[PDB]
Amino acid sequence: AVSVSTTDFGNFKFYIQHGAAAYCNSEAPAGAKVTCSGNGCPTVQSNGATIVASFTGSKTGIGGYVATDPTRKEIVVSFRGSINIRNWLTNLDFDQDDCSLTSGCGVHSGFQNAWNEISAAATAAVAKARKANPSFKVVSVGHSLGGAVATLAGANLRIGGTPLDIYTYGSPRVGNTQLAAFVSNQAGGEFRVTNAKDPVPRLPPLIFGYRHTSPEYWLSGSGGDKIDYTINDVKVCEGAANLQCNGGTLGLDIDAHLHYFQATDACSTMTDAELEKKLNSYVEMDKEYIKTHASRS
């Protein structure tokens, strides 16, 4: 099977700093020092994390940066999430375009467009700090929608030749059965962490083709605004369509999406009961789907 480990959990608590950092260093000039206010990413600042380049896709809001860690001897590519997530949920962004990563590959427009808007810069930056530190390994991070785009850049950077390791937090499903499989089976790891009943890790809906990457390192707790989870609060659900963890949960605990070992937001058209019902409705459909395919495969 698959499980969690001492250093596996340490990596988890460590990368959201780069995730939460994308929320304000996605404008930083080369040479600058990755920095966060509100203890957003103290460890990153303790080491000598520096920007190789930052970038932003005007037409799409995506933003990201490539930094080098003199201490960790690694190169990280961080993409920022939504500054207005509850907004994103009310708009139900589910339309999926075609993808050319694998046969019959489907992907979520937005995420792919965002990746496409800033891919060239993103790529070169990874290379620029790749040649300048030929020993360092690479990592692709991102929290929230930021994590979605983080998976694609991982998938593409890989086919690009440079091996990866993607770390995500509260990421929404990014593509369909075969795109999720491609990345899953793609050499390297895709550690996606989910917090309690965060409503975004279960979108878009299973019923709409969207699947996930395996495994899933779920933080089993009340979450809410909880920050003190530990290895022993972790669960591990494997498989594309598994709802024994995050997916399969309910409510509108957005607070949890905003808390993964720390505050995500440290750096910086419908009611509530309403948004919550619609979302519930979906996971209620996703379960009926899984239910009715039990005897398949």
From TrEMBL:
Family: Belongs to the AB hydrolase superfamily. Lipase family. Class 3 subfamily.
Gene of this entry: FGL1
Enzymatic reactions: a diacylglycerol + H2O = a monoacylglycerol + a fatty acid + H(+); a monoacylglycerol + H2O = glycerol + a fatty acid + H(+)
InterPro entries assigned: AB_hydrolase_fold, Fungal_lipase-type, Mono/diacylglycerol_lipase_N, Sec_MonoDiacylglyc_Lipase
Paired cysteines (S-S): 24-267, 36-41, 99-105, 237-245
Top enzyme class: hydrolase
EC numbers, comma separated: 3.1.1.3
Domain Mono-/di-acylglycerol lipase N-terminal: 1-51
Alphabetical GO biological process terms: lipid catabolic process
Domain Fungal lipase-type per the UniProt entry, residue ranges: 76-206
Any one GO molecular-function label of the UniProt entry: diacylglycerol lipase activity
CDD domains noted in UniProt: Lipase_3
Protein name according to UniProt: Extracellular lipase
Keyword vocabulary terms for this entry: Hydrolase, Signal
